[PDB]
C-alpha cells in the first residue's frame, strides 16, 4: 500500500523497487504528481528522477535512510524539466553522483535546472554508451528518440519486469499526452514504440504522470501520438 511520508508518497513495486511521488502546484493545472523510482542493488541504492524541488528530494533521501538504510550510489534523471531535475542540488548536497543525457545537461541552465555532474551519450540505436553509465547495475538506459522532449530518456530495470518511460508514456486510459510544450510531434509515436521495443519483456510500465500500468500504456500512448502527425 501507498506510504505517505511528509508530502510525498512511496509505493513498493517489486522486492527491490519503489516508486516515489511528489507534487507541485501548477497554477491553472492543479497539484501535479510526478513519479520516479528507487532501486536497491545489493548494498546500494539507485534513484531515477528527482522530485520537483530540493526539499522534496531531500525527503526522498530521508525515506531511503529510514526504509532501506543503504547509501545512494547514483541518480539518473530523464530530461531537463523540473519534475525530473528540480532537486539536483539536494542530490549534490548529499554527495550523490548524478547523470543525465548530455543534451539534458546542455539544456538544464535555460530550463532553470542545475545540470547533472555526468553526461550520458547514446549509440545510434539508442542504447547508452556503457562507459558513460559506469556502475549502473541493473539500470538499462535507452534513448528512444525525441518525443515528450528532444532529450527524454528511459530506463529498464534488469531482473524485474519494470521499465520506466518517464514523461514519454501515459497510461492506457489517458485522454492526452500531457505537456507537449517542448515535444517533437512528428517523432513522438515512433519514439514511444521504440521504448516498447527496447524493453520487450517489461510487463509493468512506470511513468511520470500516471500510475503503473500494463504495456497498453505504450500502445495507447503511441496511438494518441499518431494523431499529432
Ligand atoms: Zn517534461
Ligand atoms: Zn513530466
Note residues around ion ligand 1 (Cβ under 5 angstroms). 81, 167
Instruction: Give the closest residue to 67 by CA, choosing from 10, 27, 128, 105.
Output: 10
State in Å: Cα 94 to ligand 1 middle. 24
Method: X-ray
Q: Work out whether strand 162-164 and strand 30-41 pair parallel, antiparallel, or are unpaired.
A: unpaired
With cell 532529450, the residue in question is 151
Q: Rounded to an integer, what is the distance from CA 69 to the centroid of its chain?
A: 22
Residues 6 or more apart whose CB falls under 8 angstroms from that of 228 comprise: 177, 180, 183, 185, 186, 188, 189
From 70, 43, 84, 60, select the one nearest 5 (Cα to Cα).
Answer: 60
The whole-angstrom separation of Cα 218 and Cα 193 is: 7
Among 7, 96, 68, 161, smallest CA distance to 88 is for 96
CATH fold for the domain made of 1-229:
Metallo-beta-lactamase; Chain A (3.60.15)
- Ligand minimally distant from the alpha carbon of residue 207: 2
Q: Rounded to an integer, what distance in angstroms lies between the CA atom of residue 84 and that of residue 51?
A: 6
- Distances 181 to 54, 178, 193 between C-alpha atoms, Å: 24, 9, 21
- The 3 state secondary structure assigned to the chain is CCEEECCEEEEEEECCEEEEEEEEEECCCEEEEEEEEEEEECCEEEEECCCCCHHHHHHHHHHHHHHCCCCEEEEEECCCCHHHHCCHHHHHHCCCEEEEEHHHHHHCCCCCCCCCCEEECECCCCEECHHHCCCCCCEEEECCCCCCCCCCCEEEECCCCEEECHHHCCCCCCCCCCCCCCCCCCCHHHHHHHHHHHCCCCCEEECCCCCCECCHHHHHHHHHHHCCC
Paired with 127 in beta bridges are 142
Grid cell listed for 199: 524493453
User: Is 161 marked as a binding-site residue?
Assistant: no
Distances (CA, A) of 169 to 59, 132, 133: 26, 25, 23
Nearest in space to 39 (alpha carbons), one of 170, 206, 153? 206
Sorted by where each begins, the domain ranges of the chain are 1-229
Closest to 165 measured CA to CA, from 20, 35, 29: 35
Q: Is 167 annotated as a binding residue?
A: yes
Amino acid at each position: 500500500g501507498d506510504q505517505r511520508f511528509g508530502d510525498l508518497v512511496f509505493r513498493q513495486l517489486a522486492p527491490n523497487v519503489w516508486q516515489h511521488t511528489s507534487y507541485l502546484d501548477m497554477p491553472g493545472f492543479g497539484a501535479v504528481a510526478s513519479n520516479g523510482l528507487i532501486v536497491r542493488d545489493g548494498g546500494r541504492v539507485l534513484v531515477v528522477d528527482t522530485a520537483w524541488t530540493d526539499d522534496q528530494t531531500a525527503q526522498i533521501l530521508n525515506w531511503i535512510k529510514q526504509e532501506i538504510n543503504l547509501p545512494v550510489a547514483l541518480a539518473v534523471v530523464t530530461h531537463a524539466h523540473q519534475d525530473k531535475m528540480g532537486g539536483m542540488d539536494a542530490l549534490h548536497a548529499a554527495g550523490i553522483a548524478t547523470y543525465a543525457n548530455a543534451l539534458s545537461n546542455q539544456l538544464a541552465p535555460q530550463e532553470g535546472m542545475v545540470a547533472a555532474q555526468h553526461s550520458l551519450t547514446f549509440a545510434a540505436n539508442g542504447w547508452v554508451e556503457p562507459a558513460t553509465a559506469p556502475n549502473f547495475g541493473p539500470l538499462k538506459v535507452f534513448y528512444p528518440g525525441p518525443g515528450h522532449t528532444s532529450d527524454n530518456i528511459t530506463v529498464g530495470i534488469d531482473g524485474t519486469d519494470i521499465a520506466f518511460g518517464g514523461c514519454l508514456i501515459k497510461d492506457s486510459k489517458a485522454k492526452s499526452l500531457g505537456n507537449l510544450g517542448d515535444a517533437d510531434t512528428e517523432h513522438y509515436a515512433a519514439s514511444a514504440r521504440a521504448f516498447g521495443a527496447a524493453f520487450p519483456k517489461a510487463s509493468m510500465i512506470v511513468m511520470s504522470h500516471s500510475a503503473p500500468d500494463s504495456r497498453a500504456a505504450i500502445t495507447h500512448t503511441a496511438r494518441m501520438a499518431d494523431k499529432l502527425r
